[model samples]
Target: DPNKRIFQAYGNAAALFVQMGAYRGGPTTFAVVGLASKPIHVFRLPWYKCEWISNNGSSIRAKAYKMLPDWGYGRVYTVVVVNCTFPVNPNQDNAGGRLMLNAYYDESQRKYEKFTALEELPGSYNESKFRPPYQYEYLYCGSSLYGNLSASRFREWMAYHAWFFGPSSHFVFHDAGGVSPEVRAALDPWVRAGRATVQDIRGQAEFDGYYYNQFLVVNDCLHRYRYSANWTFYFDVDEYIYLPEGNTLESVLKDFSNYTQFTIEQNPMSSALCFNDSTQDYPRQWGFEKLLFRESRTGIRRDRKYAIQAKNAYATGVHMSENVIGKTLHQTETKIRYYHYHNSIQVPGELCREFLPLSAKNNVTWYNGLPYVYDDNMKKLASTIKDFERNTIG
Candidate 1:
């Protein structure tokens, strides 16, 4: 793990390289992302007139975006973003040089230990490549995925979302021990087909942070694919990003073009329960198809998933973007929503544990007295998704 980008500094802090922007009409920039106990100061090695320069003058303070619900780890932890921009002379070609970041750790003004990260810059700077006419119309950024994820569920989720997002989208999954050999076998075809990137982020356990350091993982993904796509989506594998009737992915995005980001409502569904359908074959159905009853609770706010214009975000979290540049619209449920199958992805096999007959009346509610409604938006697409997997990847 010596070559790991996230350099864990002494004590409770870590850093990773995000990017170095040398675009036009802007100062040459270098960004590093990680977590810190306090603030981190990043310094650049400014080479001046054939001489390497080193001083406190080149230092810039990193901004910290604290991910909430830290789960009481006994101390304040934060995800840090260090953006060091230097004055660039447009007349002089500054692309080919050494980019160095000397990160001074927590509790500044006193003597503190520092870790240096270096990267060699290339001569070519393709500004057009990072701009519109992007590589993807949509890019999925998953959190630090852990626990015993079902291989079959993973396969179904992958195929369904791959089809849902269409051909112009890409998926990025951060594996934190959840991606077992079996789970990986399901994902390998997409990786080989250039549609997905599975990052080995198991090294995140080295740092004791919130939820397998998901705050850091998500922000890293935000910057890593900043210019790679037009829209960056953040949701769990257990959740399916769904657009309601009469809305295409292209049309939804175009409708929200004026906004920087939007949140999707969660349609909470029973993970292990299904209705009794005497005519259909239950064993052959996908999880979405079999699990038909959704929670029909009113006026209670559930956790939502989101997609963002990533380039406008400086930092992000699992639920939504923390620090974004422009307007954020949360009232997007009419246009988009996600079906959350809680704890269902971690279940290895047999998602439907209990089945209620269609004639059986629910005198007593199962999910904490919450009413159930039969919605088959996802169930209707099962055959088409299965066909997509066979025709596209097979």
Candidate 2:
């Protein structure tokens, strides 16, 4: 009789728990479809452990029933649950159209304002059938744009990153005009195809100094692409992310599940010089050529960049997080590193780590052209790519 009362109490609590989730006929694809200034709402998960305890009413009939995590009845974010059975239409050119949300802050309530779907996102996506095609179960929100970068520079940067990331990765860039024609010419085709998307940075978001506007644009990028991309990283033209032992994002990121965020300790430009001398593997319009291997890495952190979990990230700036749900980890491997070629020679800012001499002959792979290094993934989807430099990539 005591057990009966215990079970009855839990059963009643479960009922109330379901009621709090605003459970209707169950999940309808989304909840609170707008900008979030408050905590998110959730529904209770189904309770199933009752079966184990209620087995033949043996244990449950003999022992008292109580609350447990395995009961599976609790609040879970919509983004967290999306991992279960998010289908892919392999027959279509673009499988998950809903992932790349095109709307802005006006409404976060229901999905509206459709965006272009991509056969290719900026870089290749390391796809897995079980969840979103995020490398290491996370999205690669690769590169973002700000200010007036030269079209020539844009082309060079795109090519370099494309080679670095391949097709599995997607790009979200922001610009408020002053883009060059050459860059526009390059970006037009990409817009039409939907492999990438561009957000016009306007209104109160266009502030000078203080980095307020930059932060807003980044936040806007987060809300729009969070649904589609698993992880979003903000990289400038001068910086590049590399996975030495791992060519694909998945290969290097395979072990980072518990980490909610990553801080790639920035390795400032190496050598005694600040800018790239022509002989030092400088970038070009034709193809990919990265830093002088012996020159790109000299220290630990002239700067550091961070990554956010797409589902739970609220970005404050390029590498700052306002609200992140998981534990943050720092990168220790130079092979898996962020190479920052800041506008300084040798060790930019003040050197942070012990200098280990690197030779060009020993690190031949680092000296190879970015295109040649990423040739395999590059060849797979290099054509039909468009840039966002033009007035309309559409």
Candidate 3:
């Protein structure tokens, strides 16, 4: 019944399938609205193609055609797919694809041009996947690259677009890069102007200049943007900030307005308990190398602070060591849980290939390699869960 409830709950929510290809731009915008029994429409765009293709070719046209039937009529759910490695044309000569939506018709081109390209989306970063109807009852914009976008133009594009899109839109910049100085600079104007809110993490800085540089920039953005709506959180991409059992981000924030920062328990993933020793492989088992959160409370770490929560937190303006004036909030046992992805490794490999190099050069210790250290814990958790499942079922 509980599993059925989960499926039914998700089923009731509109499902908009998205198809994102490689590197069209830094970010893409997806708008989702709840409707009454409308089949979710799927749209695909070759956002990472040549400027012309992204603007005025088959890709853009194809998206428009798909969208025409559902525009401005009823509630719609939108899904955006990013970071795909597919050839847009037969030539297969282009670098990759990045798709941008929400561009107005270019009057000069007599079609849709002047859209956001890979170079256009703010933060000067590249994104792979974006799903809307974000956390906190706001828009969610995320990329595979977390805190590395400090130098990217994509940050700028995100800020500008957030401003353009207004209050209804929200962003979630994920993976490795957090806030950057340029991103802070871009955010301050809008925060001062009353536009966005941000949350980010300050992982341990490494010997390299990368971590601190990015953290400082993010810190600056938080200080300068001083807007009420913006929040800077310190959590990993895999960490899903869940509301109190039934509460949403909006409800929780409403109750704890005085709190400026908070921490959530990390639920690590589990490993397969029974593996074929002869073949040395996990056959039918599906377990993560390091489950961020275990179903049971055996391996949870109570000593280390895995994430950080801040209101208007950034780098250059306010360093991580500096404590700003705000209440330290705690999640109600029922209210908040940071759902992590240390369980099943799906996107981690591709993400690591891109993130490890950047994080290594920067001295940020929050590398994918850290998960390997928890192998024993994963095994233990897996065994416990297996025992529970078998006993409970029988």
Candidate 4:
């Protein structure tokens, strides 16, 4: 019952569904996430009055932003972030009250309308917790993990990120049936240690939208942990976020503290490609340790991941944020970057398959023999993480 957060409207041409419970955005503001084709009227409790959607008004002001693109699969079912601003303090009356919500659609006419009502308890604001100086330094807002995942790759990712984010950070993994017994076993140590949480988001598949309704999951994640962390990160298990050689995580974040969001570029590496040098033993190496070639294809714009000062963001997306209060920095790859092991997590056995001989330069094109740069930073980092896990968790 607790995992049941996504709700679709009864009947409508343009699809509309609420992602989660409405939460207090501010003293007088309430925010909820859903998918809407057109637009709907939002009303608070007792008042039954439709909130006006505007930036300027003393009355109930409402606003909405489309969080994800209507690209893959469901064209009209993009997730939306809807905010309601009441004239008076709405939070004063509603603290732990159960606010029930319902949506009805008039499908015949060309109207796709949906609304959210808070019953009793939304995410209440804690002056001590929500105010300045957040509870966590880093928080990971993971996507809906669906496909069959490699437990070995997952263990490597969890150990590396757990060590990389350090002691003050937390991780949230939305298990959309991808957290198999093997994966669960790999992640359990961290969960039991109170460093991570695996949320049951298997209900996301019922919605006909992009991959496992990822937009809904992330927007829910954003609002759920809005003020809990100083920087909320959006990246996948296969993508390892990395700081460049000279920069420490603390120092980089400190320097870019003024920016609300910063995008991290990706170094897309072949999931199955290895250096293929005859000298080193590849069979015993980890995924990151063995897969060392970076895709050198140019001009093709790769999807970038991002981290945000969560408090300043109203809504977020998979690649980048859509609605943020402050400025955004796009060129942070020089400071921090992520190595994307595409399809590596989905692959079951022996990630390193086709190995090019050491004599060959970067000319070995397994998949069209695309240009590649042999980068071993992740390989070295994996070594560090292996030791750290042994010392700390063991």
Candidate 5:
């Protein structure tokens, strides 16, 4: 009867649900004060293990797990104390859709772990159906591209990615006081259609002639989209996630898992790291390749500019973070080749010129948004690193 039974109690009007395992962002103390008939549920224990805590009056508690057939892998119980007749439901998991709940008691097998396919892809997976919550995958945890970019440029970047990803995914953009009216008009249809959005990011010249409000927006988005999406990508409009094999987020991860197949002889990334700027020559319209001139890639390759499990962690910086709730996993495929669109080549004096030698190039056709034509300014924005030259020299 436990599975079908709701914890019945007198005078109970409301209930409190507490996550007992690997707490998310903050801690919740589900304590009942004066009213002795409140429903307090504790999570993160074996199905049979949520013991003895229910029967309340003055601080009642329980513990212990039994080897019973009543409970299966994740769970199969509901202590609905309905003696008082009006029992209310608790909050919802906004970010994961159904994924977060599935992972509840998914023990060591990692069966219900949908976000990361830990076992690695089929050693070489073929085209297959994508798993769940992936629709909401990139949409809400969707693309949070925050920059002081122009409206037309934003529209072009946003448009191309429409083809790059799926419909359910969102291209959430933020403008740092730079968007004009014409650009907003171009962005209107998509915004109204629910495919993309634009926001006005503030905080200019707030601190010593320097203002980087991206971190502020990034942190805010952590909780905003935590329950709505499983994975959140925090990058710039210049940064694009290109899946060499296929276009699905699943495909991207599949390639990631495939990469893991190679590293199995080694280790999986567990910390935050850096991404070297991009490098490429011309004849390259929308070309996002990387080959750092003086940058070195070594020692402790971590995940910073990559897709993170939003439900498990919070964003601490624009492109980096350490605030994590569970063991961090990286989209190795995307992490290694996440497009920076730096468009820089190595020159002795200038930070970015045209690197004659081709180091990295994305051959796959992942971008799928609307067609775009960059103007003189937009083209120059990507190619010219005058900002880089000034900063590097000074």
Candidate 6:
């Protein structure tokens, strides 16, 4: 009746279709409206348990089937419910871990379905691996050193060869610390191929102090990888450098004919003030407190190529530093913003020990005060965190 009133109020300007409550065995009424010249089609959604159609059927497939003349358009859209989980968990027994994959389409059946266990595409490297790296390893060390070694190994791999790892390429890992036997064995082929260089952290201070570990790794990639000239980016696991106009990463890099580096702005996470509030009025934040830009051009000195530094006091609040290479370019809300998902890794104690040590001996300030091991306390503290705005440009 209320919907009818609404329809009558706006009826002169629009055409309307109504359904009686008893017709569908439901409490609520549904309606469709459009201009007389162009009518709107209405579909009744069935009860949650109907079998012929469900969430298991692809949306595209469901739409296609619903459009057919044989199936009454007004009837509930029956969705077949297959045994599955909504947010597919990789570690779970039946949950599939596939992130970016589309289901197969069966033309005769007129449905889109999938059969393969989410498998990694043959040679993709996006810093996230599918199968645990052929070998798994654990390293135990202070944060600075861990960062240094990780970055150095990455650099070595990249500089050695400009190997095409494909579009979905990513590097996978088990744990961070000393190289594991599995890692050493898995990396052996690449190392033997002269495409990688494994180096020890030079000094305990150097290992415990540097903040931008990926920068160091990328630097190593440039210096040591055989085909390091092809192209590379500095991105953490969560921060993705999406190309403008849906351009592929390869196409975008190729477009800049002669540039050794590209600079992008660092968009820090937004306010956490509304964490408990449900209004959704505040700005959304990025994840992973890491840098999102990289060297677009090649052949630049390694030490001169990072986006930011922890020691540069003047370089506060998204400002450029004294270093020209480290200067901030135009801040873009469009092209690149660091997606800093700081909450993904729940290891506070490990993070503290490996990345932030309290001893005055370890100079990195960011991780100095945090506890070495993580627990519920750290979770509570992080959840209540507020955004800290420091100078990003110098």
Query: How do the residues 220-282 of candidate 3 rate in per-residue lDDT, one tens digit apiece?
Result: 333222231234444433334444336755666566666655555655433222221344233
Give the distance in Å from residue 93's predicted Cα in candidate 2 to where it truly belongs.
31
* Residue 113 CA displacement from its true place in model 2, Å: 25
Clashes of each: 0, 28, 76, 10, 23, 67
lDDT of 2 at 317: 51
lDDT of 1 by residue, 149-235 (tens): 888888889999999999999999989899999999999999999998998877666554433276667777877778888899999
Name the lDDT value of residue 314 in candidate 1. 68
TM-scores of the models, in the order given:
0.82, 0.48, 0.32, 0.81, 0.42, 0.27
> Which of 2 and 4 is ahead in lDDT?
4
RMSD of every candidate to native, in Å, equals 7.6, 16.5, 24.3, 7.9, 18.6, 26.4
Candidate 2 structure quality by residue, lDDT tens digits, 98-202:
222222222333422332221223223333422554333233443334444455445545555554555565665665553446556655565555544565544
Off by more than 4 A, model 3: 1-169, 172-214, 228-230, 271-295, 298-322, 343-394
* Local accuracy of candidate 4 as per-residue lDDT tens digits, 302-389: 8999899878888777787878889999868689999999888888788888777664454545465577767788888777899999
Q: TM-score of model 3 relative to the true fold?
A: 0.32
Cα lDDT tens digits for candidate 5, 1-394: 6589787679723312212112122221111101011213533333211111111212112222221111112222221101100111111211111102212232343332212101111222211212244436564322323223344434445554554555557766655444557556756767787776675543322321222234434544554454455556666554444443435557555555422111111112111111233542322332231222212233645434655565554334445455554554443542234444442211112233332222222121112221212112223334333343233222
lDDT score for residue 389 of model 2 = 28
Model 2: CA > 4 A from native: 1-148, 204-211, 270-300, 344-394
The number of clashing residue pairs in model 2 is 28
Q: List model 6 lDDT by residue over 125-169, tens digit each.
A: 232222233121211011212322233223223222122233223
Error of 3 at 131 (Å): 29
